Amino acid sequence: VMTDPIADMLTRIRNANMVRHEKLEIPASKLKREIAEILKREGFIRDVEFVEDSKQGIIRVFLKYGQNNERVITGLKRISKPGLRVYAKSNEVPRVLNGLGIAIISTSQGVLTDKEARAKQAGGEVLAYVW
Amino acid sequence: PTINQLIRKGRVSKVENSKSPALNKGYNSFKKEHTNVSSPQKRGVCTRVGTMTPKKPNSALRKYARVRLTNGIEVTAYIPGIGHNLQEHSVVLIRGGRVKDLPGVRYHIVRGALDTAGVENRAQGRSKYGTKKPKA
Amino acid sequence: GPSWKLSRRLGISLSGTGKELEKRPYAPGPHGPGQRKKLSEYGLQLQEKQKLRHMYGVNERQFRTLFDKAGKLAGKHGENFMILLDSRLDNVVYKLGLARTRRQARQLVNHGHILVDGSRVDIPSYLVKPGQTIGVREKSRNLSIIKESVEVNNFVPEYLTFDAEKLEGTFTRLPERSELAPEINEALIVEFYSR
Amino acid sequence: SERNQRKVYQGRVVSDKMDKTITVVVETYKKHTLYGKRVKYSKKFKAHDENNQAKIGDIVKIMETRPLSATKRFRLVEVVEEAV
Amino acid sequence: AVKIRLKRMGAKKSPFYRIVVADSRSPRDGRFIETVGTYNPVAKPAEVKIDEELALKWLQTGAKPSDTVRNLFSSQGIMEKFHNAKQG
Amino acid sequence: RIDPSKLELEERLVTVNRVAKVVKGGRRFRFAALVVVGDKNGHVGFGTGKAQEVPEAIRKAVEDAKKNLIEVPMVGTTIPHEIIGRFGAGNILLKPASEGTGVIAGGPVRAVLELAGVADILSKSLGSNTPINMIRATLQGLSELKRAEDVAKLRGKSVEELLG
RNA sequence: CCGAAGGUGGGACAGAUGAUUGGGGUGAAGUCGUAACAAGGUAGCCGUAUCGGAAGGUGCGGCUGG
RNA sequence: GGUACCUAACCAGAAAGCCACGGCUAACUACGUGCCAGCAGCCGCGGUAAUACGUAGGUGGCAAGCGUUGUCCGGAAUUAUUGGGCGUAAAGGGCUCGCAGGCGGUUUCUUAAGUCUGAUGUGAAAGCCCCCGGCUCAACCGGGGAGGGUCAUUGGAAACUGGG
RNA sequence: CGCAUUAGCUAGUUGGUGAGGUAACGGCUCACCAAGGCGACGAUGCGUAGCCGACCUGAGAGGGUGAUCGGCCACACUGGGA
């Protein structure tokens, strides 16, 4: 069943935000690894680590609460659901909260961010809003 | 619902019914059928000119003229202003206006029409009720 | 047309002077010298919109089309609309100092002719581009009204330069909105035409 | 001066039962005007097999051509993958 | 058949003509094959604009202009190139 | 933090409802006013007040409004980013607008955003039209707003690495 | 030979209209009861059968929305 | 068609009306009427002190236009892809097994149907939009460009969807 | 483009061979065979409608319209023919 695991990892990060948990295990497909690498390099995460194992592997996330109790990530969203996939052209790539958020968009040359896909001027699957 | 359910059943849009249906039709004489014309006004012949009353709390006697139209339908229309030319068997031009108070009545007789004379003693609200600029 | 009456109703000096509000600052009429009530949000938008359109005497067809043309430009919207009504030729004539009102500057364009870059313009709504030397022909060269408005001295605004004898009004870069009007609150009128 | 190129498809044979012809399901598939999701449609064409080199369940390409009869407008190019 | 011809554009009292390669069959404002630039009659000065190479391309495939379009070609000087082409 | 109320405030009101309570004798009425109070430099608040009279109710509403104040980011005299405020079947989106538009908003939303000092808002109410829940919905949407400097400090980042 | 119209026939569909008829709605402070709302004076409702001027009653089973 | 156009003579002289004014909705008093006449889009007024009726004054809106009607669209997120729901308000089939259909855990290779990108043709002219020009300005015209295709042909990518 | 309270519709219809016809391939027309063809991705039937560039509205997605101008179509008192 499970019907898509990317939306499930985004809700797992969101529930760890709302509980204010500090670590997460996520079952780590390769696109999940690249998403967490993007969220690492954009400062939404402290650090991300991989646990390569026998079942499917584990990726662990260290949620970043920079000040007193401040969820840097307020909300997540999945755009292309498995049953309505969404694809944006390069002159339609959405820039979110105009600059203050971001959209994870996996084009033909690497799983890119907003600015990366904008500077490479290509579009593909549009698979996360990250606020 | 779901997207596949939206693909195979769709969103069915809500039905629109007109507020004034006797204006919303027409008639051709030899085809013997009942065309959809959607017309603003209709002249028709009065079949009964009386007066009768509304239903509930508002209680003041209304005006009530009954007109048979060019599509064939008898409707009770309303004559708003004070003092009318009209008799039975009078040619009457009808515009669309709902009278909430009297039930069954949803049209106005155009005042200033082909035979509906302009109203008596009026200087304010000139264009409604038909009257010309009197003198000054 | 009183047109003092418009000023005391709107509560603003539409000339901008001690006249027309002294001795009678209330609006008009039998319900005027009593304490009238303050207006709503709708009333505030009507106040600012009608301040501006009764300054310039515009019908709302032309007033909306100039609102739209200011929208066709870039930048801030209500500033550009101020700029378009301060490029209007009756306003250019009244800010060169050739009239005591904007009706007199309208009548200069209507019959008591005034000339732009040559032949003539009989039309007040002419948007005036920069660089345009505006003067009068040798028929109406110096008659009683232009003589009076030369004797009376207004300020020339910094988006204009005006000569006495040669009477050519020339321009500069753009009329900045610090210079234009202190009393009219823009961007309540943009909100009024946003609806 | 090379002449103009004709339209080309690939598809899949439904039936062999017509004399020297087949019908071909092209499964190119496209999205909506409104909901945007991408749904499938099967388009079966009548195509001429002059050698009768077809089988039920055969992926085949077809080229367009002159109208070969009523409802026939297609012919074979390259029978790619055979049925088992 | 094929004719390089003026094509009426403009307001009521102020005509305008686009020099337009159309057929004699087709209506005057109607369908047309391709265009070269323009013709202002109602200007008090000049201002004809001819493309000067695609009009020449249509003259040689066979497209005979009407008289006013021909003498506009002569005024801009494309008919001298066409007579030089016949001298070629 | 709790905003100390020592500022200059303009204190205009949204509604006064007449609000009844039935006793053995009959109806006993009060006036429940809610008033939005704030300067136009980035501090907004609102408050409810109930009394037998209208002006004492407005007094208590202005006092409780000065008690509860909120802050609003004015990035380029607008709001920084589009947000939906969702207090309880009142949902109101707020877009930044261009610099000429003015506050395009309905009554209590318009009162909040004009007494906020924010000048250029596109906005829309996607829910019920009671004044109380619309003002609560706006302040839910204005509490969750974010400054680009503080979010750049949150991401271990710089402003130009976000804003461009 | 094909062939429009016409002719004959039995159907199919569609609109008017029809003695008479059945329920529905809306309407005056009409008549008969008071079924429901409280333990509404027999807790109510749901399904089903039956009976009864009528709301309804009663049986069986279910529900608490006692 | 002595038509646009230009110039001179004469007199403020020839030239302003329509709708509304409780709230929505900017704009109010008086007299008459007295659940009558009537108003009304809605809440609903009016039964002798009517800012809701009729008149007069006033005010407000626009303006050679104004108002009503009829139909579209908006408001209506009240058909919701953007943008709604289903314990009790409308709304979970009495419940199952399953055909078609829809959706598919992981790693890897390849393909290129989907996706994105380049080039070419093309989506006529006029129209909407941008930039300039001419009609007394403007509408309109004119010029130049942009725009609008899941469009056709052609070439790359292989992350993702599908195929193997 | 609306209806499933329209679920089955076809028999020159669906293919073949041969002939004829047409500017031309072709059930376009005829002979002879085969039992085929279209179909829940909505056939058939009924109802409505000239289609479009465009026009009105809308923040847009959309919804409505198909006057003028322009492209294509169809018709010419009704049906058939050359």
From Swiss-Prot, chain A:
Keywords on record: Ribonucleoprotein, Ribosomal protein, RNA-binding, rRNA-binding
Q: Which cysteines are joined by disulfide bonds?
A: none
> What does the record give under GO molecular function?
rRNA binding; structural constituent of ribosome
SUPFAM superfamilies documented for this protein: Ribosomal protein S8 (SSF56047)
Which family does the similarity line name?
Belongs to the universal ribosomal protein uS8 family.
Quaternary assembly: Part of the 30S ribosomal subunit. Contacts proteins S5 and S12.
Protein name per its UniProtKB record: Small ribosomal subunit protein uS8
Which organism encodes this protein?
Bacillus subtilis (strain 168)
Biological classification of the source: Bacteria, Bacillati, Bacillota, Bacilli, Bacillales
Gene designation per UniProt = rpsH
From Swiss-Prot, chain C:
A molecular-function term among this protein's GO annotations: rRNA binding
The UniProt entry's GO CC annotations, sorted and at most eight, read:
small ribosomal subunit
Chain intervals for the UniProt region annotation (Disordered) = 17-37
Q: By its UniProt entry, which Gene3D superfamilies does this protein fall under?
A: Ribosomal Protein S4 Delta 41, Chain A, domain 1, RNA-binding S4 domain
Q: Name one GO biological process term.
A: translation
Instruction: Pinpoint the S4 RNA-binding domain residues.
Output: 87-150
What function is annotated for this protein? One of the primary rRNA binding proteins, it binds directly to 16S rRNA where it nucleates assembly of the body of the 30S subunit.
Q: What is this protein called?
A: Small ribosomal subunit protein uS4
Q: Which organism is it from?
A: Bacillus subtilis (strain 168)
Q: Please state the gene responsible for encoding this protein.
A: rpsD
UniProtKB/Swiss-Prot annotation, chain D:
Sorted keywords for this record are: Ribonucleoprotein, Ribosomal protein, RNA-binding, rRNA-binding
Full protein name: Small ribosomal subunit protein uS17
Looking up InterPro entries in the UniProt record yields: NA-bd_OB-fold (IPR012340), Ribosomal_uS17 (IPR000266), Ribosomal_uS17_bact/chlr (IPR019984), Ribosomal_uS17_CS (IPR019979)
- Which biological processes are named by the entry's GO terms? translation
One Pfam family, short name please? Ribosomal_S17
Tell me which positions the record assigns to the signal sequence. Answer: none
Q: How does it assemble?
A: Part of the 30S ribosomal subunit.
GO CC aspect terms: cytosolic small ribosomal subunit
**What GO MF annotations does this protein's record show?**
rRNA binding; structural constituent of ribosome
Stated role: One of the primary rRNA binding proteins, it binds specifically to the 5'-end of 16S ribosomal RNA.
Swiss-Prot record, chain F:
Q: Which GO terms describe its molecular function?
A: rRNA binding; structural constituent of ribosome
State one Pfam family annotation: Ribosomal_S5_C
SUPFAM superfamilies xref list? dsRNA-binding domain-like, Ribosomal protein S5 domain 2-like
- Name the source's superkingdom: Bacteria
Q: Name one GO cellular component term.
A: cytosolic small ribosomal subunit
| Residues of the S5 DRBM domain | 9-72
Q: Which keywords does this chain's UniProt record carry?
A: Antibiotic resistance, Ribonucleoprotein, Ribosomal protein, RNA-binding, rRNA-binding
Gene Ontology biological process terms in this record: response to antibiotic; translation
Q: So what does this one do?
A: With S4 and S12 plays an important role in translational accuracy; many suppressors of streptomycin-dependent mutants of protein S12 are found in this protein, some but not all of which decrease translational accuracy (ram, ribosomal ambiguity mutations).
Q: What assembly does the database describe for this protein? A: Part of the 30S ribosomal subunit. Contacts proteins S4 and S8.
Notes concerning its domains: The N-terminal domain interacts with the head of the 30S subunit; the C-terminal domain interacts with the body and contacts protein S4. The interaction surface between S4 and S5 is involved in control of translational fidelity.
Please tell me what else the database record remarks about this protein. Altered S5 proteins have been identified in a number of mutants. Some mutations in S5 have been shown to increase translational error frequencies.
UniProt lists the family membership as follows: Belongs to the universal ribosomal protein uS5 family.
Can you name this protein? Small ribosomal subunit protein uS5
